[PDB]
Design an enzyme around this catalytic site. Structure first.
Site, PDB file in Angstrom:
ATOM      1  CB  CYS A   1     -13.306  -7.132  10.997  1.00  0.00           C
ATOM      2  SG  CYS A   1     -13.150  -6.286   9.209  1.00  0.00           S
TER       3      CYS A   1
ATOM      4  NE  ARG B   1       7.568  -3.106   2.923  1.00  0.00           N
ATOM      5  CZ  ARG B   1       7.007  -2.017   2.665  1.00  0.00           C
ATOM      6  NH1 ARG B   1       6.129  -1.847   1.741  1.00  0.00           N
ATOM      7  NH2 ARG B   1       7.244  -1.118   3.543  1.00  0.00           N
TER       8      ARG B   1
ATOM      9  N   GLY C   1       2.942  -4.698  -7.116  1.00  0.00           N
ATOM     10  CA  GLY C   1       2.640  -4.525  -5.709  1.00  0.00           C
ATOM     11  C   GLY C   1       2.248  -6.445  -5.193  1.00  0.00           C
TER      12      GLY C   1
ATOM     13  CB  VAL D   1      -5.252   0.393   0.821  1.00  0.00           C
ATOM     14  CG1 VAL D   1      -5.269   1.648   1.354  1.00  0.00           C
ATOM     15  CG2 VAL D   1      -5.650  -0.850   1.881  1.00  0.00           C
TER      16      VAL D   1
ATOM     17  CB  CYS E   1      -6.975   1.747   8.551  1.00  0.00           C
ATOM     18  SG  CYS E   1      -6.541   0.048   8.360  1.00  0.00           S
TER      19      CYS E   1
END
Ligand SMILES: Cc1cc2nc3c(=O)[nH]c(=O)nc-3n(C[C@H](O)[C@H](O)[C@H](O)COP(=O)(O)OP(=O)(O)OC[C@H]3O[C@@H](n4cnc5c(N)ncnc54)[C@H](O)[C@@H]3O)c2cc1CS
Ligand SMILES: Cc1cc2nc3c(=O)[nH]c(=O)nc-3n(C[C@H](O)[C@H](O)[C@H](O)COP(=O)(O)OP(=O)(O)OC[C@H]3O[C@@H](n4cnc5c(N)ncnc54)[C@H](O)[C@@H]3O)c2cc1CS
Ligand SMILES: Cc1cc2nc3c(=O)[nH]c(=O)nc-3n(C[C@H](O)[C@H](O)[C@H](O)COP(=O)(O)OP(=O)(O)OC[C@H]3O[C@@H](n4cnc5c(N)ncnc54)[C@H](O)[C@@H]3O)c2cc1CS
Ligand SMILES: CCCCCCCCCCCCO[C@@H]1O[C@H](CO)[C@@H](O[C@H]2O[C@H](CO)[C@@H](O)[C@H](O)[C@H]2O)[C@H](O)[C@H]1O
Ligand SMILES: CCCCCCCCCCCCO[C@@H]1O[C@H](CO)[C@@H](O[C@H]2O[C@H](CO)[C@@H](O)[C@H](O)[C@H]2O)[C@H](O)[C@H]1O
Ligand SMILES: CCCCCCCCCCCCO[C@@H]1O[C@H](CO)[C@@H](O[C@H]2O[C@H](CO)[C@@H](O)[C@H](O)[C@H]2O)[C@H](O)[C@H]1O
Lengths: 429, 429, 429
Positions: free
Chosen positions: B346, B35, B8, B293, B155
């Protein structure tokens, strides 16, 4: 020259008449009203408190209107024949018209059992002056007070005002600790106002009532007002009673009989108010217009206990502007038609301070709101009173600088060019 | 030398690999990702709003990673044989490992009937770009908007951001008064976030929604999303409808098939996420680690409509520090092991202002919280975006000075020496 | 020479005796108390936390009272004969009186199953010092904490103080992230205090508990406290449990057996507290008066779980003034009678900051309230601690300057001339 008849000498009627007169010098205008005076309604709670003399918040119409070339008929209007273009007064006079503006304000319904006999109200100058007499009896021997709104109410602000003003007066005479105070509404929550709240008005009104020891019950239906108590019912169908020596409740509004006398295409079958479109014009009789509280506007929200939408001063002044341009444009064969924005600036006076609410527009979704509170707002309220009474006496309810100032400070545009009038009032073109 | 395989190329994978490289220059490191770029996830709502270009919030990996002596394989990892210490890619290539880091991020589940077909989402760059195209149709033909979270979401923040960013955009275009907005969530109240709230976040968000005319419904289960309405069920089991022209819903998360292939000692049967202990190490295969995650962490509370725990950027960076140190200590035979603190800073960007939420730790009991809102917090979010993309390009996700600044301003320490790794992730050693 | 007997050397007893002495230097005064010291009750939570030494918050009465010509007997009063005007002590002394003042404070009821044996309390200096011992056990072996009130409680403030002070202690020790905390109350909501709220006290405490991670359960009845759990029952009659290594609960109050020993014309047949009227005088035996927690005052409201009205320091000081004046006027053949105002200033201490609550009167309708929070209020509470102890040691609980200062800052007057004492205590003449 063409002939406009205006039914009602209050905020909506004077404003439409004056707007018409300033737009069109040689137009004929006749105003019909059962009262010989204009009364400044935002000062009625103050009058009930004994903080005004009647003579200081009212304007005699007979010596005034002929100065602005407007004919005053001091009589009640009785019926409307819309096919014949006629209004008939109480003595039997028939006045023919080219255009009709209906602006009769509220017809009051004391829907609670015993309300008319056992309670007080502040909606007219005559009801307010009688409330003042009951308050002197209260100060002499204090007792439990309950104020509020029955089911179907659409004007909640003066109830909040009167409560906070009475708190203040009781406190200045050092007697508040002898007087219980309870507020009861059909609103699903405090600060709903029949508009779904204005910003965080629920949190603000709850906090204020807590700080000033006013108990409250919301989302209930007041069913009876006895000489010794108030009875209300909740959503489960349970009944409750609350002690009371003095009460002041808002009635609900319906349309008048003079409107009912027209068709079922003019008088709304559910409430007798004037059926109007976006342009405040009757869909079937295009020379009949509605201005003010008498107009039929759908509720913003279907609440568990039924409530309706208020028609505030700024909203009514925008209605009066739209309607006056619409009549003048029709006379001149100009196809442009205007809808009012229906935004509002409202100040609720508490005594020596006040709440400032601004909603743009009043019917959501909104572009913006302002909710503030301070002493400054109380002095602005007293200042607007003197200004608005000057405007009535000097023959202009909409001076150019006023629109420019509201545009500079609040980005307000009072009326909009409407491409299609056909829809409920408050819906967007 | 020893060989670590990282699966990842996102926040968790880049941070672990870079942490490992700077700890140990001799170590052989291979990173496998489907990706060819790193994408900065916190800028995805802004990408969806058309406030970013893709190239400005992403970094190509193949010309970069070799500069830090990291081998890049641009393929999907397909299976793991934990007994043979092997990873197998889609083309059949077999790569043997000494240590394995799994960091594949969220696997998206569009659980409401018709969600994937009829709604939009902002969780990947590709989905965000699709959303931008659909927003264009909303501005041309305005209708009702509903935004929120289906059952099982973990989320919530980006949904609140998107709703407020859209409100801002609509006001800058001067058409907010034409667009009803409704927020629908599986949270038991607004500002829950799947963490049981952060200070008075509930009161903050309630007031913010009321001030900006965002209607809301909490504690319900979204069952279906149609082209023209959203269908939810309440706790009484009764179903309701809300009209909807444009919708954006968060999906729920599961783990990937590559993890499922390692068996039930690595893959959590209930959700396919990586079974880890306090030290983010697998209990039965001790050369396997999980970051981000994809790690299986229990919910902070069982809510009436099921909800899960967020894994935020700060929490994941802490996971990466702890994991890198644990591997390097194994190679060197240092028995010291580390657990992440799992605290979170956050920022919810609302357009021109923002909400700042700090929770230390995220999982209660907490040492402290901070909850604020202002213009300043918007500018910090933009500033941090630039900072983080710089770090990815310059080969160090954990510069020493950053830890020191966070200590002196918020008293945070990223990792703790753990005496006993044997327990759930987030529980105290 | 007339003779008054006072039972109880607490706030009410010391304050009534001193007032009488200063009003009438030649009056004979005997004070009967079972404890040899005056204990400054407001610093018992501080004592339980280990932030005070017992000797710093107490005053031995035997060497003090002679200084102001007050006879002190260190014995428990066991019976009263109203028809004979007599008081009998535990040894057997019969004391004749012209007037009697009953001020024996709270008699504690540990209503929950296992409460006395398994929980802790802070209502006496003895209990407070034992609670400090168990807190040291908690720091050594951290675990779940639960604090609160059982059904029937009338004194809630000290429980809120203790919870916040304990949170503060844990934070300074750096172990708060290891200790869950839950507050469970019989109050219908947080910040009720048995007074129906003081301003926006509910909102304030709610936000406070959120920011400092204290979980809570209101409107329930604690039934049992076991060594490892606390058990409560909700309004639907369902049972629940919460894990707990350490607990602290408030007991409920009743009257003492020495009051019961008089007629059911003196002892309230429901709770054993002293039957008084508006002037704090017994209706049938007019030479008997009551002061402090021992007086029977109806609840302000009937709450779903039973709850009662507090008697705070300031309320009690005003009861003492009114009673002292009522006795003196009876002697001087003066028909004038007095009722206490029953206003209060209460400060809830949290460690380094505090909550300031002012209500005038405590029993509604109120003339005014003040709710504030900050560091200054903590220093204010410490300052009042020193000031009050000084007054006890110096023979005047009501120096004239204090009345003038309360008047100029808070508009407070301590007592009112009463034209008719015949009614419930706290009701308006
Ligand atoms: C008590 C009260 C306070 C109040 N305060 C307001 C405020 O502080 N700000 C604000 O923006 N609005 C406030 N309002 C609402 C509104 O502004 C008022 O209700 C207006 O007075 C309404 O204007 P209208 O023109 O709709 O009504 P009106 O009462 O002023 O005038 C009606 C006139 O019509 C006459 N009339 C009735 N029936 C007739 C027949 N059959 N024939 C002839 N004439 C008729 C009547 O005599 C009157 O002159 C506030 C509102 C309130 C009220 S509860
Ligand atoms: C929309 C959105 C916004 C968002 N905003 C955040 C914020 O403002 N602050 C904050 O702290 N966190 C925010 N988050 C959450 C979180 O920070 C992000 O979700 C992180 O990106 C999660 O990090 P991860 O490392 O766990 O996942 P990743 O998505 O970054 O990258 C995983 C990589 O793995 C690749 N991959 C998948 N499957 C593979 C297989 N089989 N083989 C090889 N590689 C595989 C994948 O392509 C990716 O490169 C916010 C979160 C959101 C999201 S809804
Ligand atoms: C823990 C706690 C804190 C607390 N904090 C307060 C505060 O911060 N501000 C405030 O305004 N009030 C606070 N109070 C409440 C109240 O002020 C106290 O309970 C007072 O102490 C009550 O005054 P009383 O006179 O009613 O009671 P007392 O306890 O002070 O004195 C009683 C005396 O009588 C003795 N006695 C009992 N039985 C006797 C018999 N049979 N015979 C002779 N004497 C008897 C007893 O020993 C004592 O001297 C706060 C309250 C609390 C506590 S839960
Ligand atoms: C004839 C047309 C009339 C046009 C009227 C235009 C209305 C526009 C006013 C609404 C804008 C907000 O109104 C403005 O808000 C601020 C608060 O932020 C008020 O309040 C401010 O002034 C007072 C001065 O004593 C301070 O005590 C207070 O702390 C401060 O916040 C301003 O006094 C008010 O003027
Ligand atoms: C990479 C390392 C990361 C660094 C960590 C950053 C630490 C975060 C600090 C957050 C603490 C609060 O931060 C600070 O809050 C206060 C509120 O009192 C803000 O103050 C703000 O509100 C007041 C309200 O009167 C406004 O008038 C003022 O214009 C505004 O600045 C500060 O602008 C903000 O900087
Ligand atoms: C002899 C008997 C004693 C008489 C009792 C005296 C009456 C007490 C009156 C208190 C009511 C007024 O409450 C007043 O509110 C303000 C508003 O925040 C407080 O707070 C203010 O001062 C403190 C002083 O350090 C500042 O840190 C704070 O930022 C500021 O707001 C005042 O400290 C408080 O005095």
């Amino acid at each position: 020259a063409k002939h406009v008849v205006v039914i009602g000498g209050g905020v909506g009627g004077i404003a439409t008449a004056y707007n018409l007169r300033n737009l069109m010098p040689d137009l004929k205008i006749t105003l019909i009203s059962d009262r010989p005076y204009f009364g400044f309604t935002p000062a009625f709670p103050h009058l009930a408190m004994g903080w005004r003399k009647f003579e200081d918040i009212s304007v005699p119409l007979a010596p005034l209107l002929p100065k602005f070339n407007i004919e005053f008929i001091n009589e009640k209007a009785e019926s409307i024949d819309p096919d014949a273009n006629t209004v008939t007064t109480q003595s039997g006079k028939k006045i023919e018209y080219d255009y009709l503006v209906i602006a009769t304000g509220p017809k009051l319904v004391f829907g609670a059992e015993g309300q008319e006999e056992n309670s007080t109200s502040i909606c007219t100058a005559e009801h307010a002056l009688e409330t003042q007499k009951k308050l002197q009896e209260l100060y002499a021997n204090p007792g439990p007070v309950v104020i509020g709104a029955i089911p179907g109410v659409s004007c909640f602000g003066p109830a909040y005002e009167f409560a906070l003003m009475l708190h203040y007066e009781l406190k200045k005479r050092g007697i508040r600790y002898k007087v219980p105070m309870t507020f009861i509404t059909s609103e699903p929550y405090l600060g709903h106002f029949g508009v779904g709240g204005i910003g965080a008005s629920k949190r603000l009104v709850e906090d204020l009532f807590a700080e000033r020891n006013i108990d409250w019950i919301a989302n209930v239906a007041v069913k009876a007002i006895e000489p010794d108590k108030v009875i209300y019912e909740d959503l489960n169908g349970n009944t409750h009673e609350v002690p009371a020596k003095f009460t002041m409740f808002m009635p609900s509004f319906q349309g008048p009989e003079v409107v009912a006398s027209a068709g079922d295409k003019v008088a709304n079958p559910a409430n007798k108010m004037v059926i109007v479109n976006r342009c405040f014009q009757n869909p079937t009789y295009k020379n009949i217009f509605g201005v003010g509280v008498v107009t039929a506007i759908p509720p913003i929200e279907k609440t568990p206990i039924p409530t309706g939408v208020p028609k505030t001063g700024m909203m009514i002044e925008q209605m009066a502007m739209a309607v006056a341009h619409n009549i003048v444009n029709d006379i001149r064969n100009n196809p442009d038609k205007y809808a009012p924005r229906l935004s509002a600036i409202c100040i609720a006076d508490f005594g020596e301070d006040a709440g400032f609410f601004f909603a743009d527009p009043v019917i959501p979704p909104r572009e913006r709101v302002i909710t503030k509170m301070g002493k400054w707002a109380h002095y602005f309220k007293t200042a607007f009173e003197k200004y608005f009474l000057w405007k009535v006496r000097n023959g202009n309810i909409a001076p150019s600088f006023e629109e420019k100032v509201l545009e500079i400070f609040l980005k307000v545009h009072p009326i909009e060019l409407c491409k299609d009038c056909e829809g409920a009032p408050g819906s967007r073109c």
